């Protein structure tokens, strides 16, 4: 369960994070059928790759949601650093295969609007981490 307990830790990390910030306001990686972590069309290889990559894209959006504080800098720092541990864990199961500046030109093009714009990033991260915990629990 060093993988269920993990995602959940990070999930509870986001839950506690949304709060410090949802208390003032008040094409991100996503899983498809072809990604195969889906009982039907299951390829443990197409998806184990899908997680690491998605987790790797998300794990760079939290390098904005860092210079986006510092009232809860470790709750903010721990989410980033705990995700790096999750990536390493999944890479250890995997076998290599999959850009920050893409997401820089892209995270500007998209940009309370700076919370509205943090909400979906963390909600989409919550949504993805759910789809991975589900994906993993079967394999």
């Amino acid at each position, epitope marked *: 369960e060093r993988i269920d307990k993990q995602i*959940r830790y990070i*999930l*509870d990390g986001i*839950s506690a994070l*949304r709060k410090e910030t949802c208390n003032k306001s008040n094409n991100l990686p*996503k*899983m498809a*059928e072809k990604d195969g972590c*889906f*009982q*039907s*069309g299951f390829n443990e290889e197409t998806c184990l790759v899908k997680i690491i990559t998605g987790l790797l894209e998300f794990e760079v959006y939290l390098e904005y949601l860092q210079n986006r504080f510092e009232s809860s800098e470790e709750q903010a720092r721990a989410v980033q650093m705990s995700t790096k541990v999750l990536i390493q864990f999944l890479q250890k199961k995997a076998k290599n295969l999959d850009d920050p500046t893409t997401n820089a030109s892209l995270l500007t093009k998209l940009q309370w609007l700076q919370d509205m714009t943090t909400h979906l990033i963390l*909600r989409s991260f*919550k*949504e993805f981490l*759910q*789809s991975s*915990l*589900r994906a993993l*629990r*079967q394999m």
Partner: antibody
Amino acid sequence: EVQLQESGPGLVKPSQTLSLTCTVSGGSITTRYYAWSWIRQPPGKGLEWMGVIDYDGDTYYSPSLKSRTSISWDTSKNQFSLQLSSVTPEDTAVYYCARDPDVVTGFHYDYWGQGTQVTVSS
Amino acid sequence: VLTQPPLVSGTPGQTVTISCAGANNDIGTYAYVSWYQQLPGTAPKLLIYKVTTRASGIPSRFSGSKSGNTASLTISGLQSEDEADYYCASYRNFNNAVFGRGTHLTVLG
């Protein structure tokens, strides 16, 4: 005398909206890792999942039932309410409130829910 | 679209099967096939969840199965009180739940 209770009406007219509310008892709404669902049942027909709100407070609706449906909540009163816009006599149903014991590893409902009847009529 | 037979009859002794035919993006892609029993005038009661896992208190005779995108439900030994409406449910991507029409179980004889 502990439940998951639904509030009325009752009687709703076509142009009007549906402000149904469920009151959670014996358990906080804000707890890991629950999801709060609205499920409806027409006079003689089958179960219809309307939408959810998890412990985070993020909503998910049925693709046909969106635009019309909006699910709210009040953490202080330990409640979660449903709103159906522009009702039709197709919305005449028994409205259920239900708990998902863990939102992130299932879509099965253990604690239902009891139902309020809601018929649409001029 | 989770297809269940409208009606299913049963020997007042034993045994019956209720099918829940789904698709790739619901029953297929996960194992969230949950079953519910509903007696008239009351709310549905959870029997099975995660295709096979029986709910706490539910008898041994209530069995859960799956082949592909079709889950089935078995009631091994019929009591005259199993006469109810049986509903299947599944997780459809992303963060949705879908139910079948239902299956009326008639205990006969």
